[PDB]
Structure 1
Amino acid sequence: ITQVRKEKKGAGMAFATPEEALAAYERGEVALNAPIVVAGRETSVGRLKFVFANPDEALLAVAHGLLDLQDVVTVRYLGRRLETSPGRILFARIVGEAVGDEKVAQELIQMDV
C-alpha cells in the first residue's frame, strides 16, 4: 500500500473539474494522471476531518464501496492539505495511537519516497 496507483489513464484537462470530471468518470481517464489548474484527479473525494479524531471521511469511505484504498491518491486534512492516500494515513495512524500523537511520526516518517 504505497507502490503508486498510476494505472495510466492518459492526460486530459478540465476547467477546474467541470469537464473531464463527470465525462471521464464514464470512460477513459480515471484517477491517475490528468492535470487541471495545478493538481490533477485528486479532486473527487475530499477527506475533511482534522487532527481531532483521525480523518473520518478517509477511513470511512474506504470501509464502504468508495475509496479503493491501497493508496489511490486522495486529499486529506490531517495537519495540512496533502495528497497522501488513506493507505499511508493508516500507517501514520497505527504508529500514532500506538506511542503518542502523530507529532513524532509526522516529522519522522517520509512521504516523498
Structure 2
Amino acid sequence: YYITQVRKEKKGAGLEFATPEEALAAHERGEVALNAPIKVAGRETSVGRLKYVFANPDEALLAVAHGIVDLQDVVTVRYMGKRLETSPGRILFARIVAEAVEDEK
C-alpha cells in the first residue's frame, strides 16, 4: 500500500496552472519558495508535476534513489505510448507484477 499512495500538503496561494503560462512560472518559483508544495491541489498539475518529467521508466526511480522524488510523490512519466501522471511507487508496483509474469502488457 504505502509504496503506491500519493501525498497532498498545503494550499495557500492560487492552484490554477490549467490555464496561464505565468501560472507555470509563478507557481514553480513560488513552489521553489515556501508557498506552493510539490503536491498541491491544482487540478491539471501541481508544480510537483511541473518540475519533474521522466522519459524512460527507470529514469523515474533513479531520481527516487538519489533523493529527488519520494515514492509517494506525484510525478509525470512516459510509458509505452502515454504520458502518464502517476507516482513513483505506483510505477514500481507496475514493474513488480510486470516482472512476476513477463507478459508486461
Give the alignment of 1:28-43 within 5 angstroms.
Answer: 28-35=35-42, 38-41=44-47, 42-43=49-50
- Aligned-pair RMSD on alpha carbons? 2.0
Show the counterpart of 2:90: 88
How far apart, CA to CA, are the structure 2 residues paired with 1:4 and 1:47? 17
**For the Cα contact (< 8 Å) 2:5–2:90, is it kept in 1?**
no
What letter matches 1:85 in structure 2?
S
SS at match of 1:89: helix
How big is the shift at 1:61? Answer: 0.3
Q: 1:62 aligns with which of 57, 64, 88?
A: 64
Partner residue of 1:8? 10
Q: Which runs of 5+ in 1 are unaligned?
A: 50-54, 104-113
TM-fit CA distance, 1:34: 4.7
The aligned residue for residue 108 of structure 1 is none
Q: Distance in 2 between matches of 1:39 and 1:84?
A: 11
How far residue 102 of structure 1 moved from its aligned partner, in angstroms, is: 2.4
One-letter amino acid matched to 1:84? T
Q: 1 or 2 for the larger relative contact order (CA 8 Å, sep ≥6)?
A: 2
Q: Match for 1:83: what amino acid?
A: E
Structure 2 unmatched ranges of 5 or more: none
The structure with the largest helix share of the pair is 2
Aligned residue pairs, count? 96
Tell me, yes or no, if structure 1 residue 77 matches structure 2 residue 84: no
Q: Structure 1 stretches (4+) deviating beyond 4 angstroms?
A: none
